[PDB]
Amino acid sequence: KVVKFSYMWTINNFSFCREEMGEVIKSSTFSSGDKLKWCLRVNPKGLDEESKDYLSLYLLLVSCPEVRAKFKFSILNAKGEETKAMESQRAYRFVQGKDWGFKKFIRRGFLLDEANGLLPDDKLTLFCEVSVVQ
Amino acid sequence: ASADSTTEG
Ligand SMILES: [Zn+2]
Ligand SMILES: [Zn+2]
Ligand SMILES: [Zn+2]
């Protein structure tokens, strides 16, 4: 009894400068079809010492009218393929305002490397796949 | 990998 859906978030004018980027940016909401609204939450720069060289990615339950779900995050490169995918082993319990994710999703050093093609035209494209347990 | 949350509980 699983409902699986996804959302592609393109972040424009990506910058490594906090005073320009903001410490926290969220995507617009999305769902499977569905009253449950979800959104992605990114910390361009990890908000703690252990994740300071990383970009943090979380899945947030915006509105809930109490829910368990698995998720997977991946970056879409310049040619549309999935890379640096990170998925939760199990499902986690979400309630309104609660998030789950990886504070060390990807190295801020990796994004800079143009060789990876992770920031085409200063655009970061993230793809999230959510599986809600019924 | 193991997921984490920005909040406790
Ligand atoms: Zn700066
Ligand atoms: Zn600046
Ligand atoms: Zn996929």
PDB file of C-alpha atoms and ligand atoms in Angstrom:
ATOM      1  CA  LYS A   1       0.000   0.000   0.000  1.00  0.00           C
ATOM      2  CA  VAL A   2       2.315   2.725  -1.277  1.00  0.00           C
ATOM      3  CA  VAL A   3       1.669   5.964  -3.178  1.00  0.00           C
ATOM      4  CA  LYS A   4       4.745   7.153  -5.075  1.00  0.00           C
ATOM      5  CA  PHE A   5       5.172  10.598  -6.631  1.00  0.00           C
ATOM      6  CA  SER A   6       7.939  13.065  -7.495  1.00  0.00           C
ATOM      7  CA  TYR A   7       8.847  16.692  -7.945  1.00  0.00           C
ATOM      8  CA  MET A   8      11.600  18.438  -9.862  1.00  0.00           C
ATOM      9  CA  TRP A   9      12.869  21.658  -8.310  1.00  0.00           C
ATOM     10  CA  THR A  10      15.034  24.008 -10.384  1.00  0.00           C
ATOM     11  CA  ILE A  11      16.888  26.648  -8.331  1.00  0.00           C
ATOM     12  CA  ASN A  12      17.875  29.692 -10.403  1.00  0.00           C
ATOM     13  CA  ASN A  13      20.718  32.136  -9.784  1.00  0.00           C
ATOM     14  CA  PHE A  14      22.314  29.709  -7.376  1.00  0.00           C
ATOM     15  CA  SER A  15      25.005  31.432  -5.302  1.00  0.00           C
ATOM     16  CA  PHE A  16      27.455  30.215  -2.666  1.00  0.00           C
ATOM     17  CA  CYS A  17      27.136  33.511  -0.831  1.00  0.00           C
ATOM     18  CA  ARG A  18      24.759  33.298   2.139  1.00  0.00           C
ATOM     19  CA  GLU A  19      24.017  37.026   2.256  1.00  0.00           C
ATOM     20  CA  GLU A  20      22.884  36.602  -1.370  1.00  0.00           C
ATOM     21  CA  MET A  21      21.329  33.144  -1.170  1.00  0.00           C
ATOM     22  CA  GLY A  22      19.710  33.082   2.325  1.00  0.00           C
ATOM     23  CA  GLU A  23      20.354  30.394   4.882  1.00  0.00           C
ATOM     24  CA  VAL A  24      17.204  28.499   3.947  1.00  0.00           C
ATOM     25  CA  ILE A  25      15.198  28.227   0.731  1.00  0.00           C
ATOM     26  CA  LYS A  26      12.065  26.160   0.113  1.00  0.00           C
ATOM     27  CA  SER A  27      10.441  24.935  -3.081  1.00  0.00           C
ATOM     28  CA  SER A  28       6.787  25.341  -3.968  1.00  0.00           C
ATOM     29  CA  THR A  29       4.416  22.660  -2.660  1.00  0.00           C
ATOM     30  CA  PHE A  30       3.452  19.389  -4.324  1.00  0.00           C
ATOM     31  CA  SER A  31       1.532  16.170  -3.677  1.00  0.00           C
ATOM     32  CA  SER A  32       0.615  12.873  -5.336  1.00  0.00           C
ATOM     33  CA  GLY A  33      -2.509  14.228  -7.026  1.00  0.00           C
ATOM     34  CA  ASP A  34      -4.081  14.577  -2.532  1.00  0.00           C
ATOM     35  CA  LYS A  35      -4.578  16.854   0.486  1.00  0.00           C
ATOM     36  CA  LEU A  36      -1.041  16.288   1.781  1.00  0.00           C
ATOM     37  CA  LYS A  37       1.134  19.164   0.593  1.00  0.00           C
ATOM     38  CA  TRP A  38       4.901  18.666   0.600  1.00  0.00           C
ATOM     39  CA  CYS A  39       7.877  20.830  -0.298  1.00  0.00           C
ATOM     40  CA  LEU A  40      11.667  20.629  -0.416  1.00  0.00           C
ATOM     41  CA  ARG A  41      13.926  22.548   1.984  1.00  0.00           C
ATOM     42  CA  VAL A  42      17.574  23.361   1.270  1.00  0.00           C
ATOM     43  CA  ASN A  43      20.337  24.920   3.346  1.00  0.00           C
ATOM     44  CA  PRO A  44      22.833  25.989   0.628  1.00  0.00           C
ATOM     45  CA  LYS A  45      25.379  25.648   3.409  1.00  0.00           C
ATOM     46  CA  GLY A  46      25.054  23.165   6.264  1.00  0.00           C
ATOM     47  CA  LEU A  47      23.918  25.043   9.383  1.00  0.00           C
ATOM     48  CA  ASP A  48      26.391  23.200  11.626  1.00  0.00           C
ATOM     49  CA  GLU A  49      30.119  22.452  11.783  1.00  0.00           C
ATOM     50  CA  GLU A  50      29.812  18.831  10.649  1.00  0.00           C
ATOM     51  CA  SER A  51      27.863  19.824   7.523  1.00  0.00           C
ATOM     52  CA  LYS A  52      29.597  23.169   6.841  1.00  0.00           C
ATOM     53  CA  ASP A  53      31.191  21.953   3.577  1.00  0.00           C
ATOM     54  CA  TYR A  54      27.853  20.544   2.447  1.00  0.00           C
ATOM     55  CA  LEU A  55      24.508  21.528   1.057  1.00  0.00           C
ATOM     56  CA  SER A  56      21.568  20.166   3.078  1.00  0.00           C
ATOM     57  CA  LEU A  57      18.363  18.738   1.552  1.00  0.00           C
ATOM     58  CA  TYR A  58      15.172  17.901   3.467  1.00  0.00           C
ATOM     59  CA  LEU A  59      11.625  16.822   2.661  1.00  0.00           C
ATOM     60  CA  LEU A  60       9.049  18.863   4.559  1.00  0.00           C
ATOM     61  CA  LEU A  61       5.408  18.063   5.315  1.00  0.00           C
ATOM     62  CA  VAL A  62       3.706  21.435   4.862  1.00  0.00           C
ATOM     63  CA  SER A  63       0.022  20.722   5.487  1.00  0.00           C
ATOM     64  CA  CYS A  64      -1.416  17.651   7.192  1.00  0.00           C
ATOM     65  CA  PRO A  65      -5.200  17.156   7.710  1.00  0.00           C
ATOM     66  CA  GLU A  66       0.349  10.985  11.222  1.00  0.00           C
ATOM     67  CA  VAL A  67       2.073   9.950   7.975  1.00  0.00           C
ATOM     68  CA  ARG A  68       4.978   7.620   7.155  1.00  0.00           C
ATOM     69  CA  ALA A  69       7.070   7.930   4.010  1.00  0.00           C
ATOM     70  CA  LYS A  70      10.311   7.004   2.277  1.00  0.00           C
ATOM     71  CA  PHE A  71      12.168   9.462   0.055  1.00  0.00           C
ATOM     72  CA  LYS A  72      15.035   9.729  -2.404  1.00  0.00           C
ATOM     73  CA  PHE A  73      16.930  12.791  -3.605  1.00  0.00           C
ATOM     74  CA  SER A  74      19.143  13.108  -6.647  1.00  0.00           C
ATOM     75  CA  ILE A  75      20.661  15.905  -8.659  1.00  0.00           C
ATOM     76  CA  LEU A  76      19.772  16.144 -12.351  1.00  0.00           C
ATOM     77  CA  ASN A  77      22.889  16.937 -14.346  1.00  0.00           C
ATOM     78  CA  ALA A  78      23.308  19.000 -17.559  1.00  0.00           C
ATOM     79  CA  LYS A  79      22.091  16.044 -19.710  1.00  0.00           C
ATOM     80  CA  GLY A  80      19.107  15.230 -17.500  1.00  0.00           C
ATOM     81  CA  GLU A  81      20.548  12.114 -15.742  1.00  0.00           C
ATOM     82  CA  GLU A  82      20.301  11.285 -12.013  1.00  0.00           C
ATOM     83  CA  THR A  83      23.445  11.569  -9.916  1.00  0.00           C
ATOM     84  CA  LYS A  84      24.529  11.751  -6.283  1.00  0.00           C
ATOM     85  CA  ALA A  85      21.302   9.993  -5.285  1.00  0.00           C
ATOM     86  CA  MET A  86      20.631   9.566  -1.573  1.00  0.00           C
ATOM     87  CA  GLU A  87      17.640   7.564  -0.339  1.00  0.00           C
ATOM     88  CA  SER A  88      16.246   6.820   3.116  1.00  0.00           C
ATOM     89  CA  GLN A  89      16.568   3.144   4.013  1.00  0.00           C
ATOM     90  CA  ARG A  90      13.197   3.114   5.766  1.00  0.00           C
ATOM     91  CA  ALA A  91      10.110   5.266   6.114  1.00  0.00           C
ATOM     92  CA  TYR A  92       9.998   8.082   8.667  1.00  0.00           C
ATOM     93  CA  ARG A  93       7.092   9.598  10.564  1.00  0.00           C
ATOM     94  CA  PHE A  94       6.033  13.048   9.396  1.00  0.00           C
ATOM     95  CA  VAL A  95       3.638  15.503  11.046  1.00  0.00           C
ATOM     96  CA  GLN A  96       2.952  19.078   9.925  1.00  0.00           C
ATOM     97  CA  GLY A  97       6.111  21.191  10.068  1.00  0.00           C
ATOM     98  CA  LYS A  98       8.361  18.147  10.392  1.00  0.00           C
ATOM     99  CA  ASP A  99      11.200  17.402   7.982  1.00  0.00           C
ATOM    100  CA  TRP A 100      13.534  14.515   7.221  1.00  0.00           C
ATOM    101  CA  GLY A 101      16.548  14.478   4.911  1.00  0.00           C
ATOM    102  CA  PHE A 102      20.363  14.578   4.779  1.00  0.00           C
ATOM    103  CA  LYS A 103      22.386  17.468   6.213  1.00  0.00           C
ATOM    104  CA  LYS A 104      25.320  16.201   4.174  1.00  0.00           C
ATOM    105  CA  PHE A 105      23.501  15.528   0.906  1.00  0.00           C
ATOM    106  CA  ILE A 106      26.261  16.839  -1.338  1.00  0.00           C
ATOM    107  CA  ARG A 107      29.624  18.459  -0.922  1.00  0.00           C
ATOM    108  CA  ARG A 108      29.629  22.205  -1.651  1.00  0.00           C
ATOM    109  CA  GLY A 109      33.001  21.455  -3.208  1.00  0.00           C
ATOM    110  CA  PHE A 110      31.452  19.086  -5.747  1.00  0.00           C
ATOM    111  CA  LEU A 111      28.939  21.672  -6.953  1.00  0.00           C
ATOM    112  CA  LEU A 112      31.747  24.097  -7.891  1.00  0.00           C
ATOM    113  CA  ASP A 113      33.482  21.521 -10.092  1.00  0.00           C
ATOM    114  CA  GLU A 114      32.174  22.412 -13.543  1.00  0.00           C
ATOM    115  CA  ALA A 115      33.475  19.049 -14.616  1.00  0.00           C
ATOM    116  CA  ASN A 116      30.462  17.483 -12.885  1.00  0.00           C
ATOM    117  CA  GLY A 117      27.949  19.703 -14.675  1.00  0.00           C
ATOM    118  CA  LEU A 118      25.811  19.969 -11.553  1.00  0.00           C
ATOM    119  CA  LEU A 119      25.284  23.732 -11.833  1.00  0.00           C
ATOM    120  CA  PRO A 120      24.541  24.421 -15.517  1.00  0.00           C
ATOM    121  CA  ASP A 121      24.128  28.192 -15.953  1.00  0.00           C
ATOM    122  CA  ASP A 122      24.130  28.588 -12.155  1.00  0.00           C
ATOM    123  CA  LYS A 123      21.004  26.451 -11.948  1.00  0.00           C
ATOM    124  CA  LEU A 124      20.641  23.605  -9.486  1.00  0.00           C
ATOM    125  CA  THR A 125      18.071  20.968 -10.401  1.00  0.00           C
ATOM    126  CA  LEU A 126      16.943  18.575  -7.668  1.00  0.00           C
ATOM    127  CA  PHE A 127      14.629  15.578  -8.144  1.00  0.00           C
ATOM    128  CA  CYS A 128      12.719  14.075  -5.217  1.00  0.00           C
ATOM    129  CA  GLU A 129      10.708  10.847  -5.199  1.00  0.00           C
ATOM    130  CA  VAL A 130       8.374  10.232  -2.255  1.00  0.00           C
ATOM    131  CA  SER A 131       6.660   6.966  -1.314  1.00  0.00           C
ATOM    132  CA  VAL A 132       3.826   7.370   1.183  1.00  0.00           C
ATOM    133  CA  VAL A 133       2.849   4.290   3.198  1.00  0.00           C
ATOM    134  CA  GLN A 134      -0.912   3.680   3.389  1.00  0.00           C
TER     135      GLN A 134
ATOM    136  CA  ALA B   1      22.402   6.453   4.287  1.00  0.00           C
ATOM    137  CA  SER B   2      20.729   7.515   7.555  1.00  0.00           C
ATOM    138  CA  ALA B   3      18.266  10.403   7.446  1.00  0.00           C
ATOM    139  CA  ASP B   4      18.284  13.206  10.015  1.00  0.00           C
ATOM    140  CA  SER B   5      15.834  15.955  10.958  1.00  0.00           C
ATOM    141  CA  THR B   6      16.422  19.641  11.652  1.00  0.00           C
ATOM    142  CA  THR B   7      14.236  19.219  14.764  1.00  0.00           C
ATOM    143  CA  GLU B   8      14.158  16.881  17.773  1.00  0.00           C
ATOM    144  CA  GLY B   9      10.957  14.858  18.126  1.00  0.00           C
TER     145      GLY B   9
HETATM  146 ZN    ZN C   1      29.486  36.262   0.222  1.00  0.00          ZN
HETATM  147 ZN    ZN C   2      27.772  38.533  -1.866  1.00  0.00          ZN
HETATM  148 ZN    ZN C   3      14.685   8.099 -10.357  1.00  0.00          ZN
END
